[PDB]
Design a binder for these strands. Structure first.
Ligand SMILES: [Zn+2]
Ligand SMILES: [Zn+2]
Ligand SMILES: [Zn+2]
Length: 88
DNA sequence: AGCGTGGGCGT
DNA sequence: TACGCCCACGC
């Protein structure tokens, strides 16, 4: 597809289809972290990454292993993916 | 293993 | 613009 939103930061060649995609990416350059955890006051560049971070404080693990007699659960989907891959 | 985080992707 | 899924990489 077409990607009209190009990043002009020094030595960056990243380009995107949407303007929010560019603005999100550019936070990696500036170090801006607009989202703060209300529990430990750590700051984050993104709201979705703040959300999964908060689960470290509560121990909430919404993603359970489907293998029989395996009670392993995880805070994020990608953790479960790696776990399921492990089970062969 | 647990999680920061960069990017794709949808709504 | 926001919101929050997924996937992968690299500690
Ligand atoms: Zn850039
Ligand atoms: Zn926190
Ligand atoms: Zn398992």
């Amino acid at each position: 597809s077409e990607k009209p939103y190009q990043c002009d930061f020094k030595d960056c060649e990243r380009r995107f289809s949407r303007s929010d995609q560019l603005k999100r990416h550019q936070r990696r350059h500036t170090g801006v972290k607009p989202f703060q955890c209300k529990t430990c006051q750590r700051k984050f560049s993104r709201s979705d990454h703040l959300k999964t971070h908060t689960r470290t404080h509560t121990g909430e693990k919404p993603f359970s292993c489907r293998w029989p007699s395996c009670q392993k659960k995880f805070a994020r989907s990608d953790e479960l993916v790696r776990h399921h891959n492990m089970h062969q």
